[PDB]
Amino acid sequence: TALVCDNGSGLVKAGFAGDDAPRAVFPSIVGRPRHQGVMVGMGQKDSYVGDEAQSKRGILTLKYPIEHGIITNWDDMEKIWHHTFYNELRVAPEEHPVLLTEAPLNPKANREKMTQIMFETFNVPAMYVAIQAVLSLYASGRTTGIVLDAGDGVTHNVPVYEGYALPHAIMRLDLAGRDLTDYLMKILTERGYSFVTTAEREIVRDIKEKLCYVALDFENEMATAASSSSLEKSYELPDGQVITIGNERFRCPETLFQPSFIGMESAGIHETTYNGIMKCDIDIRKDLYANNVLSGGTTMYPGIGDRMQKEITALAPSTMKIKMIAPPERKYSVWIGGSILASLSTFQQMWISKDEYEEAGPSIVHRKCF
Amino acid sequence: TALVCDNGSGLVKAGFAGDDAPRAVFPSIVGRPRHQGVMVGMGQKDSYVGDEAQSKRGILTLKYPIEHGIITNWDDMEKIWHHTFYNELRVAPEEHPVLLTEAPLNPKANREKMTQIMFETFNVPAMYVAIQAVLSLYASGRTTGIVLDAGDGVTHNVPVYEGYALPHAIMRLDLAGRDLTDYLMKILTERGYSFVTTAEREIVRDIKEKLCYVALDFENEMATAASSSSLEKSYELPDGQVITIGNERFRCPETLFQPSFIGMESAGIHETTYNGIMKCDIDIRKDLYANNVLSGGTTMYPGIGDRMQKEITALAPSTMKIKMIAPPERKYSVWIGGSILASLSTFQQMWISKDEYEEAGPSIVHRKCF
Amino acid sequence: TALVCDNGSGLVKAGFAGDDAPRAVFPSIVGRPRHQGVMVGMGQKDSYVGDEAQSKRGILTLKYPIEHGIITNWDDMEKIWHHTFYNELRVAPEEHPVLLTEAPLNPKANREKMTQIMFETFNVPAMYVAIQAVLSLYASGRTTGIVLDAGDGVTHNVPVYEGYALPHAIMRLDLAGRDLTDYLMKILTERGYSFVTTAEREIVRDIKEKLCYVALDFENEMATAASSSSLEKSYELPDGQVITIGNERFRCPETLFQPSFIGMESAGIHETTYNGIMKCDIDIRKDLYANNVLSGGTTMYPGIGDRMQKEITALAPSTMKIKMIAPPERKYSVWIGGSILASLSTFQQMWISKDEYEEAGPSIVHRKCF
Amino acid sequence: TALVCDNGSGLVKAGFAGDDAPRAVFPSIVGRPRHQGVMVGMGQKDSYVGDEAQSKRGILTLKYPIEHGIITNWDDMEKIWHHTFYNELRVAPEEHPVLLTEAPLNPKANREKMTQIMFETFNVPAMYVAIQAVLSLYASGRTTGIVLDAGDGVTHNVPVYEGYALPHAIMRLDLAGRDLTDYLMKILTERGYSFVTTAEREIVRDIKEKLCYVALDFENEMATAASSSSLEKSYELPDGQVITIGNERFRCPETLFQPSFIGMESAGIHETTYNGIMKCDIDIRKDLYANNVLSGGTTMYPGIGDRMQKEITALAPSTMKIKMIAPPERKYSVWIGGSILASLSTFQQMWISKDEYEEAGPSIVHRKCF
Amino acid sequence: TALVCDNGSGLVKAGFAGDDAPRAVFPSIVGRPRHQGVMVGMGQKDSYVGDEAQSKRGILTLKYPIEHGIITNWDDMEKIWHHTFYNELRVAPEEHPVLLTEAPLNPKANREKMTQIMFETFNVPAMYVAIQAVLSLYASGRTTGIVLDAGDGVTHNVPVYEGYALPHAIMRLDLAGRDLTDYLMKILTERGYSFVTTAEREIVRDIKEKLCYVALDFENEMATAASSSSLEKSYELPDGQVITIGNERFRCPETLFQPSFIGMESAGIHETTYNGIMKCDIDIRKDLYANNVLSGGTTMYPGIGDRMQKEITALAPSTMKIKMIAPPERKYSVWIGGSILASLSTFQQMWISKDEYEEAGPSIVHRKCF
Ligand SMILES: Nc1ncnc2c1ncn2[C@@H]1O[C@H](COP(=O)(O)OP(=O)(O)O)[C@@H](O)[C@H]1O
Ligand SMILES: Nc1ncnc2c1ncn2[C@@H]1O[C@H](COP(=O)(O)OP(=O)(O)O)[C@@H](O)[C@H]1O
Ligand SMILES: Nc1ncnc2c1ncn2[C@@H]1O[C@H](COP(=O)(O)OP(=O)(O)O)[C@@H](O)[C@H]1O
Ligand SMILES: Nc1ncnc2c1ncn2[C@@H]1O[C@H](COP(=O)(O)OP(=O)(O)O)[C@@H](O)[C@H]1O
Ligand SMILES: Nc1ncnc2c1ncn2[C@@H]1O[C@H](COP(=O)(O)OP(=O)(O)O)[C@@H](O)[C@H]1O
Incomplete structure (x- = not known):
């Protein structure tokens, strides 16, 4: 089987291919002891990760290795991956291919180093890098729609129509x-x-x-x-x-x-979605107006859908029918599509293998993944 | 029976011989995806044709294989013919004669290659190529009149009298x-x-x-x-x-x-018709003055008949009676006349069969068709 | 004297008639304070325009009132004109004629409102709206050429030959x-x-x-x-x-x-130039093949002329001579050529006066300017 | 001295009497701009004529003042004569006799208005209009021959024997x-x-x-x-x-x-020549069989003489000797022959002088010329 | 005139507008007897305040009513204001507007209750609450810079630029x-x-x-x-x-x-300042690197300027010109800016009036003060 490991900004969610609920959901924390250990018989460990770090946080200092979706320090991040694979999955990566998610419009060195770490440190048989919005669209059981995905670090609008994404209409905002x-x-x-x-x-x-x-x-x-x-x-x-x-x-x-509250200049998520669909071609805007797909925990607030529908209706032309897809299980939806993606037979030739890696070098991931 | 398939510049109109309406009318377009596909499945095709391509048009590029009645992209035109025969009409041409239409004064290689594609790729038992406006006049049940046929790409005047077409008088303008x-x-x-x-x-x-x-x-x-x-x-x-x-x-x-709007030097449709008549011999001019047969969707703008009547009347001699034949179904006349003409027994010897083609090469259509 | 003021998409360039270089060249920005002021003083203004807006940009939101050659924000454009007349050139417009430039195929209401504001808010003695590419061709000191003018917002090709523009051969692309x-x-x-x-x-x-x-x-x-x-x-x-x-x-x-990079479909500027030269009558193409005139800031990239000459030569027939005119001062070309327009005597009958405005309404700008 | 000004259908050939070559040889066209002029500083003219219109044709609409040997646009024709006299021959008209040419069986008002505007607009002292083919014969240095002259607009056969032309057998066809x-x-x-x-x-x-x-x-x-x-x-x-x-x-x-190619019922120029001979009396036919002289640029095609040999030989009686007389310079014949005739002393009694025109009106050219 | 009264955590500084040396400066201490008084006399008083309490600290218990900038005990601090108004400045509250200071990011009730007590128990004609860092920058005679103000209880970095604050970049630490x-x-x-x-x-x-x-x-x-x-x-x-x-x-x-010395997790004031400027816009950071302003008594240590500059050069990039502005009298800097504000004409329109309070309640002082 295959592994889906959404390394979100705040929460890491991991699971096997095919499952409907993740076998792992835990905060992306590396914790280090900020005071001096005085008990020798009990002792201490140099760093605590995951929920284990989350329980004893009164003594530790906590670091997010992921900031606005860009991996900032790779040491604690590979420790987090080592936790996921070994402690919580209790699985050996070498016999399981790995699917990873990532926010759109991200530095190339990021995916470069994820590929290198998966294939050298963990020696995965194969690995793929995908875009979170596409996976959420898969989770919705649809093919046409505009995904507004907001996690802990990144929010982004990605519209896809009959399975063809439009990169020029992808909008990214580092506010989540x-x-x-x-x-x-x-x-x-x-x-x-x-x-x-x-x-x-x-x-x-x-x-x-x-x-x-x-x-x-x-x-x-x-x-x-x-x-x-x-x-x-x-x-x-x-x-x-x-x-x-x-x-x-x-x-x-x-x-x-109103990002202006925190001093950001860009407009709100409603206006960002509106612009991301206005950059789309005329003939499809209709289908996008009725397929506002939401994903990530940042849109789990009570009543966010009604507010954002009101906003879009205010900016939208009056004739149009705006329908928002807000599944109750949306904060796992980005993960959920991965479960479907890894289970799709017609994707089984899309994995990047070790064989093609060792011949194409690290730059392989950019001519096999969008 | 026989197949009548008007490959007009903009719309393909196809049907069986004898019917009073073509079975399938659909735009002659070929769309190719212009963006990169992110949804992996079994529904995406390399190219989309016909109305199905028309509906998703926001995300495809559209090419017209026919330009000014000249067939420019032979591969896409072959694809459109394949769509027409196999999907819309759902017929096997190898057991049916086909009637095709063509604008007057066209490059000879155009109809030569049409003949070659029909006889080799599709193995049509026999096929004829007819001048479109002649067919449109056959639709109106006359033997005398000037047909001013304006399709999507080409406009043309042909005056005919007692079934004798006059080659020195056809006027062709690439403004449609x-x-x-x-x-x-x-x-x-x-x-x-x-x-x-x-x-x-x-x-x-x-x-x-x-x-x-x-x-x-x-x-x-x-x-x-x-x-x-x-x-x-x-x-x-x-x-x-x-x-x-x-x-x-x-x-x-x-x-x-007033073609001068688009930078063309040639005169307007009215004056072109008047010249197409005045190039004729004198003693027939009268019968052409009262039998102005229009056809083609370019002639469905409300008030075209009255305005063009005013123009010709201004150009015409005073004692002359100007009458114009404007069928409500004229945009299908070109097809419907074929349905008539393909049903006449006096035609059943005018088909260009396979047997004569294999011995006479592509040049036979030149010495068996006007 | 007369004032020439190129309202380019990015940079406003202004000076008096006759001078060889614009006296004031400054970006077209209106900046507004995005943060709440705390030092109570006498130097804080509701909006900053020009270089004073450019310098303080770290604390302001900058808006271009001009997008793709069509003015969308009228009031801030009036403010920019206020800067140009009163602060940069330090001139009272009431007694100096003003020359304004405009990209071709622009919405008629645009120059309608420019004319309205000139003749009411600033009460200019007279004003003329010229096409930018024609003025840039003036700067070259020629009478025949194909001007490819690309500024901040608009990229347009105009072919002219012995000084007559071919309106059907104009090409415009909103990518700059x-x-x-x-x-x-x-x-x-x-x-x-x-x-x-x-x-x-x-x-x-x-x-x-x-x-x-x-x-x-x-x-x-x-x-x-x-x-x-x-x-x-x-x-x-x-x-x-x-x-x-x-x-x-x-x-x-x-x-x-390759505008396909940014998601537009229209062809690159080389193919756009080729289509523009192709839409002209045959006997003139040779002259335009050797008089490729460039203008605007968008074409100051090193080696653009060589690449685009390579491209045209590849598309052009082998015998033809491809020659590119890339003056070192081409960025100000549209300005300097306009200076000639204002200084050339046989043109002081081409101004649109207040007197004829007061009788012909704001529509006078249409039947006295191309 | 005198002026020979052959106003052919397409090419005007003009010069002085006695010369062996026409000094001015220019196309008889008037060109008018078909687009809007935007270059205010270039010396645009309302209409261009002659070789200057020939050069700028890629932007001009071209009108031929002469169609089938008849001036249909008189104003343009006076313009063409103005260019001929003042710009090409640079000669004051009032002090020079002018020799003009004309094809036979041309409507009488043609020569009438020619003479009228020569004596009233140009104040020519005296002129003469002659049948073009007669001058062509005079060029060949013969008193006998059947002259076939085919210009740009008219073809015509005239037989002349001992200087007696026989009008009843003169043939004209408007195919050139x-x-x-x-x-x-x-x-x-x-x-x-x-x-x-x-x-x-x-x-x-x-x-x-x-x-x-x-x-x-x-x-x-x-x-x-x-x-x-x-x-x-x-x-x-x-x-x-x-x-x-x-x-x-x-x-x-x-x-x-084979005029039936363009839909004319008249026979070919070979058959027309044979008919022109056959309508003549018996005793002279032999002399015309061996004295068929060609003129006019339409007869400059290679192999025309040999073909006429073959066809007339097929038609003519076998015992008659047939000969083509195709001088290498025959396309100037209509001019050069006039240069001889205008220099002959016997002419200066045959000029239509101003004095007798002032009493006889325009009709004088009718009874003093053939 | 107007009164400027800084209630610092350790030292209260009060004075009139325009003066350059504080008329009153004394510790914010309320002292109560801790032993039993045995001598019967007229000198034993219930509670002691200010300097005179600082003299009798041997037999007293001392309470600071200001802990980390937020007021805790209102009765003793009310006694403190009463002593400042009556015993130090020897003035009456009712005929002098009062300016108060407050650390940024301070709870609602603090300043609501401060305004309440001022306008009701003391009946001040008008009061205003301002941000201490802003007034400290006023002391420097500047309008751009990042103030690091560290008093007895609160340290904070506030960056401003041409009078505009950046509330998202304000950094507060309860370490002083x-x-x-x-x-x-x-x-x-x-x-x-x-x-x-x-x-x-x-x-x-x-x-x-x-x-x-x-x-x-x-x-x-x-x-x-x-x-x-x-x-x-x-x-x-x-x-x-x-x-x-x-x-x-x-x-x-x-x-x-190194706040880790006292068990705090936050970074030192050097890193705090560097982060506080890093939060600001890019175009402005350079200006702030040259306008580091230190204020309060906590930055009066010998050698603090050199060490802070050295640390920032270590963190800041190489080319930057880093300048620390440390006036010798910075201990009263936060005070003296108010002496400017109370005297600044442009500010006489900013006070909170009693007339406006009696209608808006305590909530007024918040929509008119920062
Ligand atoms: N019920 C909720 N209401 C508001 N925010 C939530 C809720 N549940 C989760 N979140 C927020 O959503 C953020 C993102 O989590 P998630 O949706 O798993 O995406 P990711 O972990 O990939 O960023 C979390 O940091 C959390 O703060
Ligand atoms: N009602 C209408 N009014 C105006 N134009 C029409 C109308 N219907 C069709 N047309 C135009 O007529 C064009 C030619 O269609 P048609 O007459 O079927 O000839 P063709 O054989 O070229 O398809 C089409 O491209 C369409 O734009
Ligand atoms: N030296 C240069 N190299 C490359 N691009 C330039 C240069 N100078 C200007 N540009 C670009 O050209 C654009 C338009 O320049 P300009 O000719 O002033 O156009 P406009 O008429 O719209 O002001 C500017 O937005 C700028 O980005
Ligand atoms: N060498 C040639 N070959 C073929 N046609 C020619 C040649 N020279 C001239 N012509 C044609 O002959 C026509 C008539 O020319 P010309 O003999 O001078 O009679 P006209 O007097 O009408 O000009 C011209 O329009 C030209 O097209
Ligand atoms: N020379 C000095 N060196 C070091 N610390 C000082 C010095 N002078 C004063 N301080 C400290 O600065 C603190 C704050 O005093 P002050 O600057 O008046 O701010 P505030 O009273 O507003 O908190 C005092 O608690 C004192 O301990």
Whole structure:
């Protein structure tokens, strides 16, 4: 069988070919002990990875090896891959071909080094590099549609029509769930709650995950929040302290719609999708208007679909029918398509093998993968 | 039975001998993918033809194998014939005679290679090539008249009398529906609408089909258009943008009457018809004055008959009676006449059979066809 | 005297009649503050225009009011004109005639509104709208030639012969320096350099102007660039980081020769030039084959003339003599030739006066200018 | 001295009396610009005539003032005479007698208005119009012969014996070099080269002048041209494109001998000559059989004399001696012969002087000339 | 006139507008008796404040109501403002507008309650709250630069450029002089010097003020301290005991560069500044590299400027010209900028009026202040 290992910015999701649920979903963390070990009989390990690092975070310093989808340090990243293959899959890569995902429009050295690490360090029999939006489109059981995929680090619109993607219409924006978490950290100081280290960064991430939702409108929702207490909710910290939050419940995800909140110049995801489809040819825009496919955890907020449909309808011409595909299982959808892709017979000749590698050099991946 | 398959410049119209309507009418286009395919499956083809190519046209490049009645790309034309016989009519030509149509004054290699392809690639038992406008007149049940046939690529006047075609009088002008469409594409930029590549050319062709007409008097029509908005009309694109066109409706067809709009020196359709008549002998001119038979979709613009009647009447002698035959089904006359002409018993000896072809080479069609 | 003011897509170039070089050459930018001001002073303005906008770009959003030769933002364009007249040239327009240039086949409402603003907001004594390529041909001191004028937004070919333009042979393509800049941004992410903001677009534009060149051949040059680092050059960002670029030096302008790179379908500028020369009557092609006139900033790449001469010669017949006119000062050509228009006496009857405007409405610009 | 100004259908040949060559030999065309002029600083004229119009033809529409030996555009013809006198011969008209030429059986108003505008617009002291073929005979230095003269617009046979021309046997046919060129244009489309404008008509005339000849036997030459490529020849357009033409080299001339090619009911020029002899009395026929003299550029085709030998010999009685008189300079005959006649003393009693015109009106040329 | 009142974490500085030396500067201390008072007299007061409390610290317990810039105990700090208004400045609140300062990213209730108390308990005519870093930059007489302001409780980097702040680039750390003095306690225990109660906190603060300096590089300085007796210095305690300190001279402020010394995870102030500018736009970073402004008492150490510059040159790229602006009077820099703002004419329109408060509640001071 085959392995699908989505190395997202925040969460690594891994599984075998054909399965409907991932055998692995864990944060992409490398943790190192920031204080001095004093217990010899118990001892310590130089670095902790995955959920193991995620439980004892009170002592560790946490590093994301993936930042905005670009691999920044390869050492901790290969440690994360070693975890995935050995500890959690308990599998030997040498007898299983590996499928990897990646955000569109990324530096070539990135995929270069992933190929080199897979084939030399891990010696995979074959390996492929694919685009996350295409895999999400596969997961939707469709062939025509525009994928708006926003993970932890990257958001991107990729429109595909009758299976032909349009690279000139691909739009990429480096503003995603991690930057939302950072904005939540910056704004939670408004009510006197201070979080400065990565460990409490994870608390703020959990807060955004459990409490935040996307309002249908901004200004009237601001008025309602400033006029009543019905919108304030309470959350219990790991120490037992209780924090009540109000408008910042929805001001965090709305950064996806007004990047100006975090000082970015580009427009929101609605406007980015609109431009990414306007760059498309006339005859297909219709089919794209009714096939807005969403993927990644950043679009799991309650009511995001209704807000974004309202926005597009406002910018769209009145006659058109805008229909948004928001599957309940979309935060695994990018992974899910990989499971289908690895199970497709007509893809079995698309793997990049060791044989072609050793003759074509590392630059092979760019004349066999889009 | 027999097959009648008008390979017009823009639309292929095909059917069986004897019917009152062609079984399949579809645009003569060949589309090839212009982008890179990312969905791996079993539905993508190297090239798409016919209406199926017309529907996905946003993502294909469209080539017309027929230009000004001259067949330019033989491979694609062969593909279009394969589509017509095997998919639309679902017939095996090897057991059916075929009637083909051709514009007058054409390169001899064109019909020689048509004959070669029919006799070798498709193994047609016998095939005839007929002048299109002669067939259109046979449709109207006459033996006398001047046929002014304007298809998509070529316009031509042939005056005939008692079944005797007069070779010294045929007038051929390479100014027809495609050039009108291109002129509309050039002049639509006046109102800010841009249509640059092959996909939207079909859209402009559709606007020309649904909204254009020929003015009775051009200058007063400009006065009306620049004085009020009663002639401005709105059309919706596939993407919902609503375009308003004013004079643009009638400036496109008048290119048939003032070729100088597109830079052509040859005179208009009316004067071309008048010259095609005045090149004839005198004692028959009268019968041609009252039997102006029009055909081809380029002649379905509302008011073409009345305007061209005014023009010829102006050029004609005063005591002469000018009458024009404008069948509501004229854009199919070229086909329907063939359905008649292929059914006449007096034809059954006019077919060019295989046996004579194998002994006379490609040159036989020159000494057995007008 | 008379004022000539080329409103190019990227750079506005202005001066008085007779001078051999534009007095004011500055980019066409309106910049607005994207951040909230905290130092309460008297120097902060709602919008900055020209070089003063260029310098402060790190804190402003830059908009071009001109896109692809069609003006989309009217008010900021009025502001840019306010800069040109009052600050750069320091001139009162009320008593100097103004010469304005425009790309061919532009929406008629565009020059309609330019004329309206000139005759109402600035009340110019008179103004003429000339076609840019004609003025550039003036600069060459000729009367016959095919001008390929490519600025920041528009690439257009005009053939003229003994000074008569052939309107049916005009060719226009909305792909120019701006689109090359955008492509350069899209492909600089290949090496890990990310440029997303409007100010950073300007930096990529400077990169393009400094380190890009046109390759004589493309495949062999790719082989060379992938074989050695001799083509890789270094450049410093305004913040001092050093970037090394290899093949991306010559992949950026090759879009002018393979628009399929950027997703457009229309052919490259060499094939567009060939089609433009082909649409003309036969007896003149020879003269145009040896009078290929280049203008605009888009054609200052080293070696563009040699490559495009190679291309035309490959398409052109063997006997024909291909000669290219690439003056060193061609960037200002459209300007300097206009200076001749204003200084040539037999033209002071071609101005559109206020007096005839007040009676003929804003439509007068149409029947006195090509 | 006197002026000989042969106003042929296509080529005007003018000069002084007594010279052996015409000083001015230029095409009789008027060209008008068919496009809009944009070069304000170049010396455009309303119309170009003569070789200057010949050069700029690629941008001009060409009108021939003379069709079939009859001036249809009189204003253009006065323009052509103005160029002849003031620009080519650079001679003051009022102080020089002028000798004009005319084909027989030409409508009387033609010569009437010729004389009128010579005596009123140009104030010529005296002129003379003569039958062109009579002057052609005078060139040959004979008093006997049947002159066949075929110019650009008219072919005609006149028999003259001892200086007595016999009007009742004079034959005229309106089939000449112009219709030859038109038929050449019609038949060049068989190989796929299309010439439609007046400019390309001139190119086709040049191909006619360079590559056509008269075949001794038609069907033998058809067999030779259909069996081998020995007869094909290649010609180069002003653009550098190359045509290859085979049998069309000898089909274009022979419509002289088989007018049914272009649909004329009249017999060939050989049969017309034989009829012109046969309508003559018996006693003189022999002298005309051996004295068939040719003139006019339409008779410059190689092999015309031998072919006329063969055909007339086939028609004429066997015991009669037949002889072609084809001087190498016969295409100047109509001019040079006049130079002799205008210098003969016996002429200066036969000029139509101004004085007798002022009393006899335009009709004087009728009773003082043949 | 207007009052400028900086409530720093450790030192309160209050004065009038326009002055150059603070009329009042004193520790923000509230002291309460900790023992039983046995003498019956008129001098024993419930609670002591400011300098006079700093004198009686022996029998007092001291409380800072400002901890990390956020106000905790409102009653004692209200007493503090009362003492500043009445005993220090000897003025009445009701007839003098007041300007207050606040660290960036500070909770909502802090400044709402500050404005509340000012406008109701003290009845100030008008109040304003501004950002300390901005006023410190005002002190430098500049309009562009990144301020690093480190007081007793809060350090923060705020980059601004031509009066426009970049809120996404503001960096705040709760590590300042108070934490430094606590660290100095924690490390003085090695040499047997013990300081536990709040009274000796002032002693150790005086020690830190009088003795510590920033080493150019930490490690060679540590080797020097462990190798020789050149550096240790003697301080005279209030009780007469003398202490000699060595490496603890430069270990105390090194915490600002390596917060891991006090268990914090964040990077040092050098890396904090470099990141804070890296968040800003590219086109501006160079300007900020030359305009590093240090302010507050925490950057008064000898040698801090050289070490900070050295570190930044290590992190910053090579060519950059890095300049640190360290005015000798920076301890009051944050104050004096207010003395400008309160006196600046353009600012007299920015105050929050009592009239506007009585309608908008506490929420007014937020939509008109940054
Ligand atoms: N219910 C939720 N609401 C809001 N955000 C969520 C939710 N679940 C996950 N996320 C965010 O989505 C981000 C991306 O996770 P995922 O969708 O797996 O893509 P990837 O891990 O590839 O970036 C996570 O960083 C997380 O913060
Ligand atoms: N209703 C209409 N009005 C105007 N033009 C039409 C109409 N219908 C068809 N046409 C044009 O006529 C052209 C030629 O079609 P047709 O008459 O069938 O001749 P052909 O044999 O070239 O297909 C088409 O390209 C189409 O653009
Ligand atoms: N030296 C150069 N090399 C390459 N490109 C250049 C150079 N100078 C200018 N350009 C490009 O040419 C574009 C247009 O230049 P210009 O001729 O001023 O056109 P416009 O008339 O639109 O102002 C600019 O956007 C710039 O990117
Ligand atoms: N060498 C030649 N071969 C074939 N045709 C010729 C040649 N020279 C001239 N002609 C044709 O003869 C025509 C008539 O020329 P010419 O004999 O001078 O009579 P005209 O007096 O009508 O000009 C010209 O139009 C030209 O096309
Ligand atoms: N010469 C000095 N050297 C080192 N630290 C100092 C010096 N002077 C003052 N400090 C420290 O600076 C801190 C902040 O004082 P100040 O600059 O007034 O800011 P604020 O009072 O606004 O917090 C004080 O707690 C003090 O410990």
